[PDB]
Amino acid sequence: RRAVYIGALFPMSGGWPGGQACQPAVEMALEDVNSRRDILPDYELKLIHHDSKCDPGQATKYLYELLYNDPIKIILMPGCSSVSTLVAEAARMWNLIVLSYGSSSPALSNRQRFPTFFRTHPSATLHNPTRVKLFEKWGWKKIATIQQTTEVFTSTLDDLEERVKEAGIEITFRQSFFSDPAVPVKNLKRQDARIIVGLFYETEARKVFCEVYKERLFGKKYVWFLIGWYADNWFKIYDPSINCTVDEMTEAVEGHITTEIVMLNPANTRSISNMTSQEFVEKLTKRLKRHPEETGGFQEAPLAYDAIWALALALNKTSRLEDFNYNNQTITDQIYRAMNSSSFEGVSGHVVFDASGSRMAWTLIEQLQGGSYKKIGYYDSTKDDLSWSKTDKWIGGSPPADQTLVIKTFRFLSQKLFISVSVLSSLGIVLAVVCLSFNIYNSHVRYIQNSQPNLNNLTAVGCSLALAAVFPLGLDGYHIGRNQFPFVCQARLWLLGLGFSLGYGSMFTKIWWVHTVFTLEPWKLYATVGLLVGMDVLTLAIWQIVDPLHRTIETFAKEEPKEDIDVSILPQLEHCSSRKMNTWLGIFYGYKGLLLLLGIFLAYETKSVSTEKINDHRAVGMAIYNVAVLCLITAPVTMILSSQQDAAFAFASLAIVFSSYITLVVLFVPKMRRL
Amino acid sequence: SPPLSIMGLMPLTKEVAKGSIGRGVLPAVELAIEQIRNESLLRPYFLDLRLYDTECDNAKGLKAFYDAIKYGPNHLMVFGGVCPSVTSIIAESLQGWNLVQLSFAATTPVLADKKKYPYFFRTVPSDNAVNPAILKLLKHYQWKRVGTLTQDVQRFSEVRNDLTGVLYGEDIEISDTESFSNDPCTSVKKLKGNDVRIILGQFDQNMAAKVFCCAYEENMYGSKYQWIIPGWYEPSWWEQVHTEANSSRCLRKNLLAAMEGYIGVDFEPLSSKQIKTISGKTPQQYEREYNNKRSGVGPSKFHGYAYDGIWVIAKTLQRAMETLHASSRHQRIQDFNYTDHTLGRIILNAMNETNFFGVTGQVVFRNGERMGTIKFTQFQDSREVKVGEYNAVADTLEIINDTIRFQGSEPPKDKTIILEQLRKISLPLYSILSALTILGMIMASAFLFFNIKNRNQKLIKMSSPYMNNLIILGGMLSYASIFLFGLDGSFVSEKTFETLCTVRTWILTVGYTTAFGAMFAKTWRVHAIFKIKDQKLLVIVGGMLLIDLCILICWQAVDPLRRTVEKYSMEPDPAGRDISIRPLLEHCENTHMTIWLGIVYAYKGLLMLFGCFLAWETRNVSIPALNDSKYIGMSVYNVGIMCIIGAAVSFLTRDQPNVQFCIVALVIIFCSTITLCLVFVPKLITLRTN
């Protein structure tokens, strides 16, 4: 039989040692293809393998060695991505065919630059339909990346940032380094990101995790995304090129998320080589020497096993290959046309390398807990299948987030300060009405000798409606303050406008008469008093129906609650006010205060006698002086104090209660005196 | 004369876009060999230069490289390479045959890692020779708050990574660090929100029009900012990249006034000065000879940095060739089958040291990189002008003065001004309250005149002279307290401020004591009525005042209740320009404000409550005209209420310094006038009756 030759590069060390599991596997394939008499009746295949570490220097040297040695070769079988790209770019001047098996760069899909390139490894954009899904379950919108500046990761990051634009999520911070990552990690710590996705090699993984330990960028509020085809114990080896220790990585890599792609048919079929899948697994694990858990590149063996069978079937399809030069075209195009139209079934399911890539479907997701690997859940891309298993263990049983801020309205002491005021009002509100009743039924000669009780019923009704005004004053957003809050403040204002004006007028008209008499009564003064109070009623109703007080929120307080949660509280307080208040309230209080000063002037201008009507003038003068001074002292304070947590309510309530008490006692002392 | 040949790779044809550059440097080397050929430093040998073609393509370049290796004589070094990919592909795989590569136009920063480029030298300052010069310029203008805006390519990330290591150690901090891919001015909006004023940019030529127009909408121009941009763009690059078949989203005349006076940083092609260089002629001689040397090929800007590199190569080979051995050394330099590692080492180690004055100044290396010269340019009247220079061995920066200018009349500032301000009392209020208190003092003087006038009159009831005199003396002494309260830091200059607050407390306590004594004289009568000494009641009120005053004076002798000051940084623009002002206010406190003040306030409250109990009990003891037990009662109830109000008010209004002074002043003045009038004026009306 004649003999043909193939060229192969097997990486056995460096950033991705795969050849240690890949060199025997190809060596398990030739002995099976050279034993079946169907596919090759008069030819043998031989292999020329060389180590490269996928470094471009040794790769260039051995490529020069292969292209200018004896005998003449037919195909090349590259390794890692930097050499696959170099051979695919350089092979256009010799008319060869490049068939890779471990490269997953998306930029190798551009057929304009790479005409004679084929691969069995799937594209690396298959992680992007997955990650967005894990971004919608936990609800995030701000992420950050860090990468090693090779185009294999730049194009994948470009595709992810292109396809994340439709789900609303947006990148915020980008970093880069070529060989020394200390300054990007320092800047990332100083910028304080929380969700980080890493794209770098294994040795740089160690040289960044000991420096993320040296910058304390881990713990409870940091999430790390990594790649999945690393070794199982890629941190438990001794490396003299670092200064970090093993427990400073054992505490550093706890709680990161890894994603990988499945690569083996889980079913039970019959392949093209009459062999199931776990028997293949058993034979491969027997041929090796170390354990399959730490042997590098163990997952990618059936791809190379089908990568040989596909070319074997192709070489049966062509079937004059002994005078093949490096400058004749008719064979390269003949084999190309035979390879473009090939599809069959092998070990990794159906093998159809003729597409735009993307012939696998599923992925696989894992997390690290306690120094052990755990499988979270599978995924399918087409039918949106998501076989969850509910085993993810966060800190505190819940994943972190970025940072938020809550909005909080203020309240006050809804029990201690309010129920006491309520019972204190209820103690007097009933005494008021029973003294009014005593004024009612006492049709008595001597009471007729005293003043006419209509002006005392006016004062009593005024003080009763004023007393019954703490309940609209104490209520807030705790119970009712949702929609009819403007009506609660309206109730306040109506009660306030009535209950003060009525009693003050009912005293003021008596003091008016007792002034003007001294130095007709049954109808003159009552009607002009009624007119004056109806005037006062009109004033409130004018700018209560044209420019009312609905609601107003005021926010002052700052950030930083400084509790155990990073959340930030923003306190506010709502109260009833119009667009303009400091004019109307001022003018009404001054116009009323002038009337109060006029009343005290009229009380001062004669205190001496009383005759034939009533003689209550000393008591009513003292009571009205007391009420006047108390109101004049209390009222301009609550306009000044805006912190109405415990001052402005308490002052007004004390004023109201003291005024009501004094009014009651002054009004219904002489009845007990005369009886 | 056996020859020795060196390889060269450069584009040659005219069908490419970057061929003339090669066709720009071919005459220059064509001079230098003849200059050697006129002196023949290699006397027993002969120099040979082989030229090939790459067209900056990997397949053709690698094929030509392999063919030159396979079908060529023994080569020694490789010189050339202009396309930024095939150069890196060669240099990363140069160690297998032990050769050294010399480039003159590759200014990409990735060739600075000598961990995978051991055999690569260049004679041109790369983009990392810009970072020192700029820092020193900052030390000429004191700019410290700076912001960077970079793209995301390799060379624009290497420069941003190098800036931290260069700018480490000095007192300059990088405020922001942004990076965009297609939309720049979302981070331009972040820089606007962060309020930066000096911008250092790293982006290519295409993104500049978009950045300056959307950066023009946000108003980051005028006489308030300064941009530092790389300057290797071709001339007049903006009159045509802005057209770009329409590029309507920003117009021309609203951009030429936006990109005004940015600073461009580049290197310098030739030397301005004149000494005798290594050839034996002036730079002017070589420039005239080059300018009349070429026939029709257009000029380039890199023929000088390679014309000296060839002479560098000749001198290194001459300094490496003549070691101690001769016969074996000529056998060793003609047996080169690309395997002699020692020959490679003696070449690298002899090329490593070199020091002479070439045509671009001194040619000295540092870790492979040449120490060179940096040129600064500024943009005026749609044209670029040279403004400076930066040496590297002398580490000086020369500015061509009488040329540079700025849009305002001074260099801009890094940040706005922080101004601290005190909150003062309104002077009309202080004048009015002082005049009212002075009028009350004069009224008190009149009252004392009346008290002294009829001091010996039988109609004066001949009862309680000393107690009324003591009451009115306490009131006169208390009015000086509200005279003394309203001080200010501008009128004390921190000379007596540490004493006035605690003598305010002195005078205040004296007033309290005299108040309580005139309070207690009534209750003494009521205690007598509810059932030996000439001055013992006066003695006992003095004893009470003395014991509680030494309690205070010693407590405060121990207590250095002194001045403090807090601030509230919420600085808005009041004047409207830019000075941010914050308020700060002073105090006079102590580390035990609760114990001592709480004790004295509680004891004054207890005295007030005892007076309230006495006023509640007594309403009518049938006192003759010698006593006035009702006015005193009215006074004590109006005093107790006024005091417990003014107390709760002064403890509450802390954030409003212009209402608590007017409050304490009104409560004191009003209380004292009402008390004095209620005490005095019934006797005044009696004297008016006479």
Ligand SMILES: *[C@@H]1O[C@H](CO)[C@@H](O[C@@H]2O[C@H](CO)[C@@H](O[C@@H]3O[C@H](CO)[C@@H](O)[C@H](O)[C@@H]3O)[C@H](O)[C@H]2NC(C)=O)[C@H](O)[C@H]1NC(C)=O
């Ligand atoms: C690998 O290929 C061999 C064939 O070369 C497979 O063995 C075959 O197994 C089938 C059953 O799956 C046998 O069928 C049986 O045939 C016998 C008579 O030969 C009959 O008595 C039974 O009732 C049944 O029909 C078949 O004979 C046998 N082939 C030979 C040559 O004996 C083997 O299953 C293949 N392995 C895998 C993993 O697919």
Ligand SMILES: *[C@@H]1O[C@H](CO)[C@@H](O[C@@H]2O[C@H](CO)[C@@H](O)[C@H](O)[C@H]2NC(C)=O)[C@H](O)[C@H]1NC(C)=O
């Ligand atoms: C990084 O590693 C170097 C070793 O090259 C450290 O230097 C050693 O420091 C220890 C003290 O921790 C000494 O006992 C050794 O004798 C040192 N050896 C040498 C060769 O210097 C260096 O301290 C480490 N630095 C950091 C920051 O980890």
Ligand SMILES: *[C@@H]1O[C@H](CO)[C@@H](O[C@@H]2O[C@H](CO)[C@@H](O)[C@H](O)[C@H]2NC(C)=O)[C@H](O)[C@H]1NC(C)=O
């Ligand atoms: C690929 O291999 C198969 C099996 O060896 C070839 O199949 C042909 O099978 C028929 C079955 O009756 C035989 O008569 C033919 O003689 C077989 N061909 C040959 C060349 O022997 C098939 O032809 C091969 N494909 C090619 C040669 O393109």
Ligand SMILES: *[C@@H]1O[C@H](CO)[C@@H](O[C@@H]2O[C@H](CO)[C@@H](O)[C@H](O)[C@H]2NC(C)=O)[C@H](O)[C@H]1NC(C)=O
């Ligand atoms: C090489 O194979 C590709 C496969 O993608 C061919 O592209 C066509 O792809 C479409 C996809 O729907 C198919 O419908 C066509 O049948 C494919 N054409 C052929 C001839 O198979 C491409 O044409 C092939 N041939 C080349 C590039 O010469």
Ligand SMILES: *[C@@H]1O[C@H](CO)[C@@H](O[C@@H]2O[C@H](CO)[C@@H](O)[C@H](O)[C@H]2NC(C)=O)[C@H](O)[C@H]1NC(C)=O
């Ligand atoms: C190449 O030359 C440089 C400069 O001569 C050497 O750098 C060292 O520089 C310091 C600074 O003056 C000197 O004190 C040292 O003596 C120099 N080291 C020497 C001359 O060995 C550099 O080390 C040289 N590199 C090699 C490989 O010889």
Ligand SMILES: *[C@@H]1O[C@H](CO)[C@@H](O)[C@H](O)[C@H]1NC(C)=O
């Ligand atoms: C856009 O096209 C119109 C049509 O000719 C032209 O008038 C206009 O100048 C163009 N805009 C710019 C900025 O050149």
Ligand SMILES: *[C@@H]1O[C@H](CO)[C@@H](O)[C@H](O)[C@H]1NC(C)=O
């Ligand atoms: C430099 O500028 C100053 C202006 O302050 C000028 O007085 C001086 O002459 C200049 N020196 C030059 C142009 O050499």
Ligand SMILES: CP(=O)(O)CCCN
């Ligand atoms: C970057 P690469 O796809 O060539 C290595 C893939 C390892 N599973």
